[PDB]
Ligand SMILES: O=C(Nc1cc(Nc2ccc3c(c2)CCCCC3=O)ccc1F)c1ccccc1
Ligand SMILES: CCCCCCCCO[C@@H]1O[C@H](CO)[C@@H](O)[C@H](O)[C@H]1O
């Protein structure tokens with residue numbers, strides 16, 4: 001058992017193993033950047049806030065723990081450590097999670113500057129490679145955006161924050177429109193949004209609200225064709241969407257003037273309204289735009305993921321006990 005020490009951060013008391021040093025709040029549970037004197041790594045230390053206050057908190061806590069334990073991929077955030085001061089299940093009330101701190105997010109690079117095509121290749125290849133792994137385990141991210149893309153100095157990229165500035169500029173349209181159900185291509189829409197911005201230096205759909213965002217999207221990728229219209233039940237919703245100028249798809253060049261034609265071709269395959277018609281992560285990895293980086297025997301897939309818990313409505317003491325067993329059984333990466 002590690003030796004713990006108390007320290008006051010983000011209006012709470014952190015109680016952390018003494019190997020973790022220089023805890024400094026990054027965002028607000030809440031996260032501190034730190035140095036791990038035992039491994040030599042820079043690490044993000046997240047303290048969950050009242051993880052067992054309610055059913056929703058308790059299940060949130062269990063899910064993030066579970067998802068973090070599962071991910072073992074170069075381009076996806078993984079668990080370095082998880083710890084509790086608690087010496088038993090009954091004393092158990094606090095949860096901390098330790099993660100790589102890559103150093104910056106993908107906002108800190110966009111900088112409103114055109115990245116080169118070469119750099120966009122390398123950056124998008126990694127996102128796609130990470131997504132392939134996540135999607136192979138039946139997990140949809142649902143809110144992929146530059147903020148959730150961690151990079152280091154060498155531009156190594158890790159995807160973070162993926163469970164069951166404006167924070168809606170990258171969201172698939174169906175996600176905004178309370179669509180009963182979602183496929184994995186919701187994240188591919190996000191990729192197209194991010195890729196587009198890296199090449200142009202500019203937000204692709206900078207909506208001012210919900211309805212604006214939707215209008216900006218119909219402007220670039222046009223009014224739903226007949227194949228997609230058949231998949232929308234409401235006649236009043238169709239009438240409503242068609243009351244927004246009902247014009248055909250823009251050709252996808254005027255935005256991406258000067259871009260690699262292969263990049264443009266990829267963005268056209270990502271940024272399809274009909275989610276059934278978007279390129280998948282694995283398909284996009286084979287697209288000629290990634291020829292310099294694509295290696296079919298180094299694009300790992302995930303072990304299958306037991307997400308049964310996801311459909312369960314359980315009592316707190318069950319989520320708590322389930323979480324605690326996940327803590328006690330944790331093995332760090334060698
Ligand atoms: O990412 C999940 N949880 C999680 C997120 C963090 N957050 C960060 C880590 C590193 C960095 C940054 C934030 C941003 C500042 C730039 C440096 C950097 O690199 C820390 C610890 C965690 F546990 C997650 C995963 C699945 C479901 C729910 C949440
Ligand atoms: C404002 C116009 C936006 C509406 C277009 C969103 C289309 C999303 O695509 C739809 O998503 C569903 C999965 O979520 C699938 O069941 C449908 O087959 C697919 O067409």
Ligand SMILES: CCCCCCCCO[C@@H]1O[C@H](CO)[C@@H](O)[C@H](O)[C@H]1O
Nearest residue numbers: 177178179180231232233234237241
């Ligand atoms: C602002 C533009 C109006 C968007 C109207 C789109 C409403 C889509 O509505 C969605 O259609 C799906 C297929 O019928 C259903 O499965 C979902 O229940 C429903 O939310």
